[PDB]
Amino acid sequence: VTLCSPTEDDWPGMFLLAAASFTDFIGPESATAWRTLVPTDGAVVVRDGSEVVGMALYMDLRLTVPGEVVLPTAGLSFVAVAPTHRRRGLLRAMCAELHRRIADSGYPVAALHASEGGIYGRFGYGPATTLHELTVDRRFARFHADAPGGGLGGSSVRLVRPTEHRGEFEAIYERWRQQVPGGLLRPQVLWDELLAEAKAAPGGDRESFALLHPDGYALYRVDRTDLKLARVSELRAVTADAHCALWRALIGLDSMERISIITHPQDPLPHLLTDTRLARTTWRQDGLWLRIMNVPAALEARGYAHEVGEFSTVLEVSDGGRFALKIGDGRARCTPTDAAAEIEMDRDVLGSLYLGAHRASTLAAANRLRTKDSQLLRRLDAAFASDVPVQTAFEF
Amino acid sequence: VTLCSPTEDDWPGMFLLAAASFTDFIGPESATAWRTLVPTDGAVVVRDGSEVVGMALYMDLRLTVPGEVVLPTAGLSFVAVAPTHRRRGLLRAMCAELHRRIADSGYPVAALHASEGGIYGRFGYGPATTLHELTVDRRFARFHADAPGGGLGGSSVRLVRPTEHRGEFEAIYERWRQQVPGGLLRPQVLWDELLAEAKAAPGGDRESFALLHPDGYALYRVDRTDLKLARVSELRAVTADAHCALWRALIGLDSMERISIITHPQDPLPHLLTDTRLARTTWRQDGLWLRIMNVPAALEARGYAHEVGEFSTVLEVSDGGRFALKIGDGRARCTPTDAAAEIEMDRDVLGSLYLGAHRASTLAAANRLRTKDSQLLRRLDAAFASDVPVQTAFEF
Amino acid sequence: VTLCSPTEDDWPGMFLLAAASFTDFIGPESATAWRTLVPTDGAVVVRDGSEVVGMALYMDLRLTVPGEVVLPTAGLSFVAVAPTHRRRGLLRAMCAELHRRIADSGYPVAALHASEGGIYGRFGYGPATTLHELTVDRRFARFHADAPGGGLGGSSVRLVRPTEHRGEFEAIYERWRQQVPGGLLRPQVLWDELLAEAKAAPGGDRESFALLHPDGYALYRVDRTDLKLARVSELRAVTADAHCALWRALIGLDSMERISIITHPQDPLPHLLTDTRLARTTWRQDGLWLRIMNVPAALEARGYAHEVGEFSTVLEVSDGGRFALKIGDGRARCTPTDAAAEIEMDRDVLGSLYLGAHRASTLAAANRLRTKDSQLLRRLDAAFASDVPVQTAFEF
Amino acid sequence: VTLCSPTEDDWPGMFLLAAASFTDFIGPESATAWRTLVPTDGAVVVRDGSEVVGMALYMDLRLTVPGEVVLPTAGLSFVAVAPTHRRRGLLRAMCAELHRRIADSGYPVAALHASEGGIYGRFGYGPATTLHELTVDRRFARFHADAPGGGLGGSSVRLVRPTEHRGEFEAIYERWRQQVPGGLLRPQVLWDELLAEAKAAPGGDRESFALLHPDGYALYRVDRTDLKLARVSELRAVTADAHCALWRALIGLDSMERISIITHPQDPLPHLLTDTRLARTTWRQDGLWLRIMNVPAALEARGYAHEVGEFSTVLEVSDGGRFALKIGDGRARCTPTDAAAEIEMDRDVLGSLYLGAHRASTLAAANRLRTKDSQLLRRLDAAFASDVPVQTAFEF
Ligand SMILES: Nc1nc(SCC(=O)NCCN2CCCCC2)nc2sc3c(c12)CCCCC3
Ligand SMILES: Nc1nc(SCC(=O)NCCN2CCCCC2)nc2sc3c(c12)CCCCC3
Ligand SMILES: Nc1nc(SCC(=O)NCCN2CCCCC2)nc2sc3c(c12)CCCCC3
Ligand SMILES: Nc1nc(SCC(=O)NCCN2CCCCC2)nc2sc3c(c12)CCCCC3
Ligand SMILES: [Cl-]
Ligand SMILES: [Cl-]
Ligand SMILES: [Cl-]
Ligand SMILES: [Cl-]
Ligand SMILES: [Cl-]
Ligand SMILES: [Cl-]
Ligand SMILES: [Cl-]
Ligand SMILES: [Cl-]
């Protein structure tokens, strides 16, 4: 068992491991696009004597955090151990090497989408965003009097072929990702990939349609099997008007019984309707997971709630450092100290708090976050909260 | 069509209307217990010429709000129009009369549990708490190292017959309801009713069991049809230790595949497990609905976040008054004014904000809450938030 | 194997055979009511050497036929062979003896409800009425402008306890059964039985409610398991106004998603709605089966379409006689002849034609009805048709 | 918003609207065949300022009506409003313009297949044929002694590839459509299309097989997912012998559990079996919808029952004219009058009566058809009835 950077000869062995480990595999011909996001030394493989029995890599990503700050992010992906080589500490070795490389390269944070919720906590990954599926029975949906864009005149929304309006979608997304915590820069190769999935596949997914507004878009397709269900794959709205106009159009798909979307807990859609209950939550799951690589750099980089008074404390991350933490005027200063710790938590807990998706009070109730001062807990709660609700950009 | 207070002769007609309008009817012999909570003049009926074709009443309740303040609450229940008399404005007439009576009696707030989510908004009722069903696959559930009560020695939890420990359940509940927003005083007649439902019914519900801790309890029964599913009907925990100890015991029901509970969004259970995903959200719905009867009295009665600086504004409720609102040191002063309104909202929106379950930002995004100052929105958000997460006490 | 009339000692053996042969058994204590409709010599049993291994009886019924004529009808019921004694010609022997008795007693027709559709044809029983289940999604149901009782004022329909309005239901039913082909006289013992099934059963059927009009009623209960489905067990309407008023009330059961009723193919309900498709046909099956015992007596007893000119023919029933048939002024004369047969059919086919539910053309297309004159076929079609659509009264 | 005839440049915009409005879309390359049936000025589109936001067209069809008379029929199809432009009266404007064009062109009737049952009544379209799905459990199916083609010798039915016997299918269909009310002329381009759907599609529909008789054919394929179910897509039989022979062959598909067919209520198949119940009705729905464009021309063009005596009346269609109607010797004369109306009905009701599928008595019971003379109702019933049962030709 050897652990090293893959050579060009190693990749066919990696794609074989990938096909047997991931069911949703797009093959090795759309792997060209995703490979461009893997830096030199971004990947590790484990050989037996010889076939690939273990692999893992990171991708160079740009992650928006509260205060509209953009962090270089190491995106963990393509992590697999052969079924022949389980319970052999290969994952632990591969994860330890990549984290070494990611830290030495100067990434403040790493991120991943979890295949299971029970693996990544012990690696210091905490769930940081929440996926929220809403299903609307659009046959009963009436918009509230208070809702925008209910007046006469034309709709500002057009039904369009996605492939013909790439430039417009990019510019809306680019604005969206820069102003929303959880936002990711979407490179050109991923727009290429997104608009190739937009066409109908033979005995597969149906043609994608687009609803386009000056300040928003929605990509949707009818479900393969349930022909009364429209799945919104992606809805990006920069303004409240765009979000309403796009939903007014989706509720007007008169041949559909149900619109479903994977969105965030704070999606205002339920409040646009006279009956909030018509937008049922049909699924909830952790979205993006964060490992804080550098505590001082990550805590100093993000903005904090202006609405909490200046305060100071000592934060200990288990095997991650102890820090004098001082937060005021929505900025933090995080400096080394050996003074008595007022707050203790494992590294994964800090990832979970970092984007505002989880409350310090909630993690404290489960004893994942230790302090003896409930005042300090209320202050952490308020300071780490996000004015702009945290969303999930796209799976990697 | 006449609208008046029912006489003793009217109640058999009301029970007939009730049987035909509500499927979950416990009959007229457990209606004796619930009737004790209806004050003199708490009920209206509509007769045709003569049978009961319309009814509605309120019950005298005590509702805990943020700051551990207990408000007299008019609990709307038993609202029905005969299928023979729909679309005749009977509900509008009955609701207008009860609201007249509730206001004149000096109730600051009214509350209800909604049969449908599309009826009650136009009456100034906003959804104020969120029901959150968690289902645990307890076969995979391992408690986190950080979780409390994982050490050796005895369990502080006992498996007991509910009927034999009424006094203990009352005292824990009484502590719970006083410290939690959404908490309701549970009168003796409702403890009588709760412990009569605890015994097995012939070709019906199975026997209820209780897990008792000094500072918490859990009532659960196996599902009628799914014999691998335990439904926790009620879990009241005053301390984090009690909540963990009770969940450790429930995860030890080795003959069950699944534990389900209807809880609140901030339940710390997912964070007690090594795999947060094992506690799936399988259902979400609005719980208690609030109508603010008296805006000044309700806004002044509750506590506000100490962690936001003193601030002042002018609040207009549509057909509910305009008010100079001044919040600081976690107290509000709400006084009449004709000065230009900075915040506008319908009455139902204020009910939705009142217990901290919904964010002003979220309601603002849907244009249910109008202001031109985003700073003022952040301040409302922070001030109306609840330190103690809001829960739902019991259905009425 | 002996075939004779049962003695009082034989009935416990018959009830044992009944319990093992029929799953929907109401026991031997509601068998007292149904036994009153069995005449002396109405029953046969087969013993082995001794237990009951075979039984069959008829009940004295009154059946309305086209022209509002009421015929004495032998109602076959309680027919069973022990699982120990199949393929032994016991059914053939029992059916031959009862038919001997029924004919000698002077019954023009026999009738039954079929447990299977493949048994009774060879005994000369033809399906004569059609059961038609309509399910309305009442959430979309709007009444047509043209529909009756859409104006202001009170509803003429009352929601009532069935047990309190027995007299009213009897008088409406009594009018209904006399004016509708397929109508049965419902004796007092069967009203006793019907209103005992109207109360809720412990871990069984839910309480029955009644909608009462001067000229109609509807009995309905919520389904045991599907709590959004109301089953209308029985709807008797003497006028079009009563039928609409009752359906307006049923569509007003706002807690239900679906109303289902077992009705007849010509039920006007679909045409009362702006969307005829909302009343889906979810089930169709043969209802009452007729064996014509005496061809001349049965053909002469019923009325014929006044709208077809006088005509004459020769009808042969296979092993049932040949007859000169002369129809005009809505009366028939049926007399013996040896003249060449113009129409041939088995006896079961005549039962199927007798109430107007099946067209001679349709049975001719399947060669169940032979003639060489298509003019004569059109004339039979028109003459045997029923002005008043044929309905099914009640199962026996 | 402009309403005009589409130009060649408008059609790609129409196909985009079509893809987003209809899930069962065959694309724009089989749209060439269907476009040949659209006359010059057969289509309208609505543009916004510019994309197609509304479209509708008619096709030139030939519809057989009672008396084997063939009417030029305007077949409405391809009707869609963009989800962006609902509740803007675009459908009303497009339908009013096409109906203007259809009337001025001299079409006596228009027809459509309804996407929903609640749209087309207000446009004067009445459901005129009834689709009836029969499912046979062919494992229990035994043919009656009386049924044709049960004797020895060869089967007159051959199992064949459809593509190799186009000429034979055309000639049988051509005979069928000319002798059956509801029959449509099937042009060459639609035979091209029908035999292209007969071959297996990759990850789609299975290969179609044909059973060919001198006087009938049946096209069937195994269901995609249920491999024990054969769907008969089309069965055309000119004689009773052909219908039996084809069904004898289908019942001989020994690898199938179930044969299903969409047929008409008067299909004689149930009567060919010893057990009529084995042919279950598993689905019922309205088929073709008729709008009578010219009342006098349509009423005079069709044949009437010879078996009803000569009679005269005055018929008023709401906003459609008042007419002296005189029916005798199976012909009608329909002439202008201002004499008192004896029969009133909306235009849609007349479409529903026109092919004999619905009885005047049934529509009268729902007050869709007003008269004060029940004798006149019986006469309408009998006269409008169809000797040959009405069938549905093919969807457009
Ligand atoms: N990181 C990549 N993503 C995608 S599609 C976006 C997505 O939903 N990912 C979650 C699921 N995921 C799909 C297959 C892989 C592993 C698991 N496609 C590819 S292809 C590929 C990579 C990759 C990884 C980086 C470069 C090697 C080849
Ligand atoms: N307010 C009452 N609650 C209950 S059980 C607790 C519950 O889950 N209620 C929601 C469902 N609900 C059950 C039946 C009634 C209306 C709807 N039982 C009764 S019985 C009764 C009332 C009442 C209302 C007040 C006094 C008259 C009789
Ligand atoms: N003829 C009778 N009907 C009924 S309930 C009405 C009904 O839906 N019948 C169809 C089903 N059926 C139920 C049980 C018996 C056989 C099959 N109950 C009884 S009880 C009984 C008879 C009978 C038959 C005549 C007298 C002996 C005892
Ligand atoms: N009238 C047409 N029919 C068909 S397939 C036969 C069928 O089952 N139609 C009902 C469903 N229908 C399918 C797609 C269209 C609208 C709805 N295909 C096409 S393609 C097409 C038309 C058309 C309409 C006339 C010319 C433009 C393009
Ligand atoms: Cl690489
Ligand atoms: Cl996503
Ligand atoms: Cl009272
Ligand atoms: Cl609850
Ligand atoms: Cl007897
Ligand atoms: Cl029945
Ligand atoms: Cl054209
Ligand atoms: Cl068809």
Coordinates of C-alpha atoms in Angstrom, one line a residue, chain D residues 169-170 172-174 176 186 190-191 194 197 208-211 216-221 231-237 246-247 250 260-262 392-395:
Chain D
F169 CA -55.0 -2.1 -42.3
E170 CA -55.9 1.0 -44.4
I172 CA -60.2 -2.3 -43.1
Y173 CA -60.0 1.1 -41.2
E174 CA -61.5 2.9 -44.3
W176 CA -64.7 0.9 -40.4
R186 CA -57.2 8.8 -41.4
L190 CA -51.1 9.6 -40.2
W191 CA -50.6 6.0 -41.5
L194 CA -48.8 5.1 -36.9
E197 CA -44.6 4.1 -33.7
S208 CA -46.0 -3.6 -31.8
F209 CA -47.6 -6.8 -33.2
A210 CA -50.7 -7.1 -35.4
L211 CA -53.4 -9.7 -35.5
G216 CA -60.5 -6.7 -38.8
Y217 CA -57.2 -6.0 -37.2
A218 CA -55.7 -5.5 -33.6
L219 CA -52.4 -3.6 -32.9
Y220 CA -51.0 -4.4 -29.4
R221 CA -47.7 -4.1 -27.5
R231 CA -52.1 -3.0 -24.3
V232 CA -54.4 -3.2 -27.5
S233 CA -53.7 0.3 -29.0
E234 CA -56.3 -0.2 -31.7
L235 CA -58.9 -2.8 -32.7
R236 CA -61.0 -2.2 -35.9
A237 CA -63.6 -4.9 -36.7
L246 CA -59.5 -11.2 -33.0
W247 CA -60.5 -11.5 -29.3
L250 CA -55.8 -12.0 -27.9
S260 CA -56.4 -4.0 -21.7
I261 CA -58.1 -2.0 -24.5
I262 CA -59.6 1.6 -24.6
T392 CA -63.8 7.3 -30.8
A393 CA -61.5 7.1 -33.9
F394 CA -58.1 8.6 -32.8
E395 CA -56.7 11.4 -30.7

